[PDB]
Amino acid sequence: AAKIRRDDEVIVLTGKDKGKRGKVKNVLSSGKVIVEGINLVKKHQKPVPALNQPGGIVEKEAAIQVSNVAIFNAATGKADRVGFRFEDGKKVRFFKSNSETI
Amino acid sequence: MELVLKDAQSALTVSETTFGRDFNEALVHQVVVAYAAGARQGTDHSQKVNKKMYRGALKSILSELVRQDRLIVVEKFSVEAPKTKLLAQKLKDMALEDVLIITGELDENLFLAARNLHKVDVRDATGIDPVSLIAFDKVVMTADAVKQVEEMLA
Amino acid sequence: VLKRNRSHGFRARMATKNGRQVLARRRAKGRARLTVS
RNA sequence: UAGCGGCGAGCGAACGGGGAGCAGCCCAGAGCCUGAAUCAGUGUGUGUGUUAGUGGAAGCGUCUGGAAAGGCGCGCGAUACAGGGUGACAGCCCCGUACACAAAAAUGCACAUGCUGUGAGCUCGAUGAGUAGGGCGGGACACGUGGUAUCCUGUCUGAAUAUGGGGGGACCAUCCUCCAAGGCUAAAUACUCCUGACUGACCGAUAGUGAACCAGUACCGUGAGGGAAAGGCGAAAAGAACCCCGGCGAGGGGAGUGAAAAAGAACCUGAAACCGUGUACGUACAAGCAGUGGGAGCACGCUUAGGCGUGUGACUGCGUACCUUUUGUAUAAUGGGUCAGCGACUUAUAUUCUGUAGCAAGGUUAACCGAAUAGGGGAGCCGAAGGGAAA
RNA sequence: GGUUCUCCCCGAAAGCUAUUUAGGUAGCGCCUCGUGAAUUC
Question: Which of A9, B44, B137, B145 has the smallest C-beta neighbourhood within 10 Å, fewest atoms?
Fold first, then answer.
């Protein structure tokens, strides 16, 4: 019963990048999600003599709180809450404000 | 004396002694302190208060509220359905924000409606304490509630 | 080891009823070392 | 409390009443009649609960700021604002609450049916023998075998059923009940080492518990007993690529990242005391636990002449330092190295005395019960016949 | 040894008395807070 899932179109509600849309890549058990292209962090990658020698500065994605993003409605062009309803015995997600199935 | 109404303007008869006595500052304070001490759990600070002293304090507080027109007597105060909006609307039109709905009999619809609101509190005549009466900005009674208050005060 | 566990060991107290009360306090206060060996 | 004790301090009962959150059974039973009434144990099915879960309405935006839970204007919600976490103080961006549903296993409280079940009503009888008392030999009941009651009675012996015994707040007497070996009796009340929910005029790392994390620890002792210090990680680890110096280190300086870098693995804020640098003033002829005041000279900002104030301040005058302990503490008589944190409650339970406040010749109830502080309840403690030594 | 911070007004004694039984029982003029209070001293 998680509102945010593996493949979801979400929009940032708060933070330095509020309002930019994106797709969630994965969700952490600590109530955090990773969405590509918004929370860029410049990590100084220490060089290693192993098979991989990227070194330099890497542009990674930093996880953000689940509550900081909402599913994009994609029809009203604004963030909307999502709830659960039982249909033919299968639990599904649905928007609000003219709620329609995903 | 005579308690003026605002909707029906119907005369009410109440004993002068129990609603027109002077304001005993010292007695009221001691009862309030005693009530606050009884609220603790000391995890006992409870203090004995004489029945006459407790009753005398309530009469003084009731008299003071009437003088400062913080007490309003109305007819039955009920809500057709258990919805907070109905109670909120019925108070906004009356221009009441911090009120104590003291009713003659506990009604589930009214009780549920006021349970969410924090500035609005609903109680029965039996369930009244000096601290709540003073704390709440306004108190609205019912005719039946006043009548039962008269007799048990005596 | 030789003359240490035969008189100050675990079985040296369970052989009588008086030594049973000695090992009873080790159960309530379970240290890292129960008995010497 | 009525009693008991060199009537020294202490220890220490009952009936009635105010409060019912008690429910009073079976056997000595022959005979006419049994799978009865009242119930328990062991299975299945239905209905109602407990122990794991799911669905569950309700805030869109703008200014300032890197980032908004707060501010201004317009609304929804409210049986639901109990609490905490979600970049700053969040009903409505998440996790928890009304309302509406499910039973493959197990358990508990009323009810269909079945097998084994110590077993009723009516009539005809009964109401408990190695005992009490007495004799010989011991101990424990405060009492040494006393003026001595009551409780227990090995071995050797031995009665009765209103012709014998106890009780009615205990001389003798009367009437009723009772008069020796049977078998049972729930819950509340006691107690808090473990779980879930809920609560607070208790506390926040020298507090609280030995112990908030790898505390029943490191370490010590033959064993046992006893017994320390230590998180203030950041919102997110963005926890230094490259270059220079050096010892292919430690440590430090740049750049980059971030709102902030004297917060850089001693890591939010960083005091007093101890130990340094730079500037200004005084001291190398000064008076021995000398500080304030008066006075001269000099320095960084008085200031459209104004020795106005502070720190420093040669020299002068006044004064036998301070605390504890004492018939005195200026003493060859004695005590503390300083700073920070911590530290030796006047409570609970009787009586007595004082102050404050409500009906005015009903001033007061405790426990329990209660829509859990009000209402209801007076069996006690403290008072209401003074004057009169007392009556 | 120790009755702990601050603060305003006021504030009992030396070698003594009765005199036993000793590191103590009755008891100290003058002085304090409250009350009573007559030109009493």
Answer: B44
Other C-beta atoms lying within 10 Å of the C-beta of residue B111: 16
The DSSP bridge partners found for residue A86 are: A91
Quick check: B47 CB within 7 A of strand D?
Answer: no
- To one decimal, the resolution in angstroms is 5.0
A28 in Cβ contact with A65 (< 8 Å) = no
Domains of chain B: 2-153 (3.40.1370.10)
Q: Residue B150's closest CA among B133, B128, B125?
A: B125
Tally Cβ neighbours within 10 Å of residue B40.
10
Q: How many other CB atoms sit within 10 Å of the CB of residue C21?
A: 9
Helix intervals (H) in B40-117: 51-67, 84-92, 108-116
- Chains touching B, CB cut-off 8 Å, 3+ pairs: none
User: Among chain A residues 19 through 48, which have CB within 7 angstroms of nucleic chain D?
Assistant: 19, 31, 41-47
